[PDB]
Ligand binder design. Structure first.
Ligand SMILES: Cc1cc2nc3c(=O)[nH]c(=O)nc-3n(C[C@H](O)[C@H](O)[C@H](O)COP(=O)(O)OP(=O)(O)OC[C@H]3O[C@@H](n4cnc5c(N)ncnc54)[C@H](O)[C@@H]3O)c2cc1C
Length: 447
């Protein structure tokens, strides 16, 4: 039967609290950034370090939404050719991040073992590793290989299933999302970025093809350069300017369980639906296999491109239908800049957690690794993501509105954030980007 429990709700941040910059909004800024997630913040840092004045506006709290809620494995494994450099260089930048900011983001190089279920999986793993090893950029080699026997069994200590082979990304990363983006926000503030929380951006004023200001709920700020890094809210923001972003929301759930003696370390991914990541604080992040699509207005508006999230393919997908459906039609898609926007109602949006999903993955984890019988649940939460239909982010200028640049629509933003932040800064400043952004352009959606 069809579920009725998936719901979009207002919530609170689960990430470390970041104080707003003191005082009034500035009257002008060289660049204004909409959103205080990892993309807004990493973009701000790259621009500030180039000597520009930068202001971030955040309707709720820093890392209140996706960036504070992520499973947060930092990996390149099985990425496409267009995406791989973003992940490969993301990892490079993360490895230098604590040094850069003189603080601990919680980033750790920990390694990731993915058990492979059969020869077909093994074939696909070896094929990707072969090509990635040959094409790895930025004068840094890939450190991903196949392992087996004694080596694998000790990596997967106490495992009840006879796993024989696995892809091992030895330099995979981990960052605890409660810690990472907030600590980067603090660094941003130290280098002169101004961050104003509880401050929604309603829209952008422009004429003659030049942006003149952004309008917030607390006043306007003059600028000719704007970055929209609004996460799931980017589509809605752009719809009010007559531009369509093809993104569809998906609901997820996550948890933390306590560490136990004799548990495997680092990052484990098994094909029988078991995925955990040891955190810097001793607890384990645990991710269920499944996602839910709550049926809403945009499910019909974007459906043809998104059939892999709406019943086609064999992704682990569950439909849900409820209050969301009717609310999605009541959600305004345009508003004047002098009236209240939907951003001022859902300052810290999330989805209701699915307890059944979280219980099921944890039980599967206890069966496969009996030491976790003595582990208990530390924390549980829900989250919303909003990918494009083509497995590519939107990192692009907006031709219609010179001065506007978008950096959004990724489900790998923890990994990509540092790299995407630099690319976005390059687009803003007119520098030849560190990674060619053609594949991430809005041009791919025209005609
Ligand atoms: C369950 C889950 C697991 C994940 N696991 C991984 C993983 O293992 N590895 C990985 O790399 N990535 C992962 N991600 C992805 C990563 O969390 C996101 O891609 C990334 O956080 C996106 O960052 P962002 O800055 O674009 O968006 P967000 O973090 O959502 O930031 C957007 C911010 O903009 C604000 N905002 C929006 N509109 C306005 C406005 N008009 N005015 C002012 N402020 C506004 C919002 O309040 C929000 O704080 C996961 C995500 C989820 C949900």
């Amino acid at each position: 039967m069809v579920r009725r429990d998936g719901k979009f709700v207002e919530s609170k941040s689960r990430a470390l609290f970041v104080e707003s910059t003191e005082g009034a909004l500035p009257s002008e800024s060289d660049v204004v950034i909409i959103g205080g997630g990892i993309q807004g913040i990493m973009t701000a840092i790259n621009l500030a370090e180039r000597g520009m004045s930068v202001t971030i506006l955040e309707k709720g709290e820093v890392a209140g939404e996706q960036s504070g809620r992520a499973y947060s494995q930092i990996i390149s494994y099985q990425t496409s050719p267009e995406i791989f450099p973003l992940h490969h260089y993301g990892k490079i930048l993360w490895r230098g991040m604590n040094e850069k900011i003189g603080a601990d983001t919680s980033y750790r190089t920990q390694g990731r073992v993915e058990a492979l279920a059969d020869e077909k999986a093994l074939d696909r793993a070896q094929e990707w590793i072969k090509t990635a090893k040959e094409t790895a950029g930025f004068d840094v080699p890939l450190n991903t290989r196949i392992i087996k026997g004694e080596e694998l069994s000790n990596r997967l200590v106490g495992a009840q299933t006879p796993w024989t082979v696995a892809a091992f990304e030895e330099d995979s990363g981990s960052v605890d999302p409660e810690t990472g983006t907030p600590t980067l926000a603090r660094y941003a503030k130290q280098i002169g970025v101004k961050i104003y929380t509880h401050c929604a951006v309603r829209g952008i004023e422009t004429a003659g093809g030049k942006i003149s200001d952004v309008v917030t709920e607390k006043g306007a700020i003059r600028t000719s350069n704007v970055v929209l890094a609004g996460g799931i809210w980017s589509r809605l923001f752009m719809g009010n300017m007559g531009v369509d972003l093809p993104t569809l929301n998906v609901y997820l759930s996550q948890q933390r369980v306590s560490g136990v003696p004799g548990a495997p370390r680092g990052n484990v991914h098994l094909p029988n639906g078991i995925h955990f990541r040891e955190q810097a604080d001793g607890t384990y992040a645990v991710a269920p296999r499944i996602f839910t699509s709550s049926i809403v207005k945009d499910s019909f508006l974007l459906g043809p491109k998104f059939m892999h999230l709406l019943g086609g393919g064999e992704l682990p997908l569950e439909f849900s239908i409820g209050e969301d459906l009717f609310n999605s039609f009541k959600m305004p898609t345009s508003w004047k800049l002098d009236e209240k926007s939907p951003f001022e109602q859902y300052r810290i949006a999330t989805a209701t957690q699915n307890t059944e999903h979280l219980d099921a993955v944890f039980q599967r984890m206890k069966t496969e690794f009996p030491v976790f019988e003595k582990s208990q649940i530390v924390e549980r939460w829900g989250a919303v993501v909003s990918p494009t239909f083509d497995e590519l982010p939107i990192i692009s200028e907006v031709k219609e509105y010179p001065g506007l640049v978008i950096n959004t629509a990724t489900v790998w933003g923890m990994t990509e954030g540092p790299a995407a932040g630099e690319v976005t800064a390059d687009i803003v400043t007119g520098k030849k980007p560190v990674i060619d952004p053609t594949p991430f352009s809005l041009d791919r959606f025209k005609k």
